[PDB]
Amino acid sequence: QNVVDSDTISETAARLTGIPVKKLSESENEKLIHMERDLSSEVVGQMDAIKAVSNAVRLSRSGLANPRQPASFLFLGLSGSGKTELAKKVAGFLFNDEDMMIRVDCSELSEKYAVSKLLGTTAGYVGYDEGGFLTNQLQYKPYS
Amino acid sequence: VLLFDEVEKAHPDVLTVMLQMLDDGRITSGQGKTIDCSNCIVIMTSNLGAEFINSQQGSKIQESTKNLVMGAVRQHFRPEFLNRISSIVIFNKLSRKAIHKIVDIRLKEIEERFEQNDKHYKLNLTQEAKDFLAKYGYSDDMGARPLNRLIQNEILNKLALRILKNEIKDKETVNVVLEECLEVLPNHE
Numbered sequence: 001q002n003v004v005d006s007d008t009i010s011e012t013a014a015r016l017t018g019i020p021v022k023k024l025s026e027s028e029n030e031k032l033i034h035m036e037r038d039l040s041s042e043v044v045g046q047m048d049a050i051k052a053v054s055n056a057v058r059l060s061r062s063g064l065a066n067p068r069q070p071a072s073f074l075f076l077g078l079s080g081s082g083k084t085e086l087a088k089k090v091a092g093f094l095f096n097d098e099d100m101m102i103r104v105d106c107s108e109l110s111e112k113y114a115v116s117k118l119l120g121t122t123a124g125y126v127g128y129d130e131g132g133f134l135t136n137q138l139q140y141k142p143y144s
Numbered sequence: 145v146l147l148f149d150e151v152e153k154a155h156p157d158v159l160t161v162m163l164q165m166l167d168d169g170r171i172t173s174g175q176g177k178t179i180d181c182s183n184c185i186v187i188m189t190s191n192l193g194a195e196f197i198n199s200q201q202g203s204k205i206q207e208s209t210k211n212l213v214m215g216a217v218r219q220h221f222r223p224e225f226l227n228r229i230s231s232i233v234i235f236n237k238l239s240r241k242a243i244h245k246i247v248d249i250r251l252k253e254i255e256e257r258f259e260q261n262d263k264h265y266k267l268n269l270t271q272e273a274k275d276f277l278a279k280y281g282y283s284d285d286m287g288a289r290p291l292n293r294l295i296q297n298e299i300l301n302k303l304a305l306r307i308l309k310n311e312i313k314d315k316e317t318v319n320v321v322l323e324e325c326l327e328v329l330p331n332h333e
């Protein structure tokens with residue numbers, strides 16, 4: 001036997017670090033197709049959004065998407081239209097669990113605290129435990 | 145149970161924060177810890193509808209008045225806030241009949257505040273005082289509140305003096321004045 005660039009290393013790294021796109025999965029039906037269907041099954045209307053996400057996500061497959069840019073969306077629209085429900089359903093698909101989404105409490109922001117609660121502070125300041133919402137999660141969840 | 149007294153005065157910025165609290169309970173601490181308070185009850189209060197409750201359109205608030213109040217609410221809070229409210233409730237105007245029932249209750253509370261048995265009413269005048277108080281407190285402009293003032297000003301202030309003057313040991317009585325006053329039981333004893 002041997003170490004295969006793809007089937008062994010790409011997959012090994014993914015098992016170690018996460019990153020589903022490097023698992024070079026055998027099916028974009030049971031990963032992308034079902035995504036559109038199931039997101040559509042639960043989120044009615046906003047089909048346009050579902051496809052926008054699914055396609056942005058599609059581009060990350062095999063690492064095709066830009067190495068320096070997260071899939072990124074801005075959801076505008078009528079409240080009650082699923083602006084955050086879709087996001088949960090996306091996590092619901094991605095991690096097979098809606099609760100794996102990292103919610104960032106942007107509702108509470110002031111330029112004097114707004115960054116610090118996400119990224120924490122430097123030495124010499126009361127409490128280090130940096131990273132409340134972003135650093136502490138992203139360090140452990142590369143494709144959250 | 146959380147209670148936010150006079151939410152209309154809260155700056156919209158904090159209400160923005162309340163949006164998390166009010167949906168999924170994901171209110172988080174300053175340090176990034178999630179509280180998870182979905183098991184709680186949240187009650188907020190305001191006076192935004194006062195301009196329409198003051199329309200005096202019935203006891204049970206009538207239609208139109210309720211809608212104008214909703215208008216005031218919509219013109220005050222952002223829709224996203226209002227959308228996270230399980231129920232928006234408009235209180236009723238406290239009618240004379242309500243006032244009579246209220247008087248019964250408030251008088252009972254006075255007895256419940258009586259830590260010692262030298263502060264005790266038999267009261268009497270359960271129709272006369274009840275009627276007096278009910279008429280005098282029947283003012284839309286203050287809801288049930290002036291009753292607290294009526295009781296204090298017509299009954300308790302006088303009681304305080306009677307106590308200071310040792311004109312009462314226990315089991316007090318209110319008498320009708322053409323106004324109200326108290327019975328002298330012992331007299332400077």
Ligand SMILES: Nc1ncnc2c1ncn2[C@@H]1O[C@H](COP(=O)(O)OP(=O)(O)OP(O)(O)=S)[C@@H](O)[C@H]1O
Nearest residue numbers: 042043044045078079080081082083084085086224
């Ligand atoms: N298209 C939809 N299909 C099925 N259920 C929906 C849909 N849109 C909304 N809902 C339901 O209504 C709510 C939508 O939630 P949200 O996406 O937060 O609404 P919202 O627009 O995010 O509210 P904000 O203030 O903009 S986050 C969810 O609790 C869903 O149950």
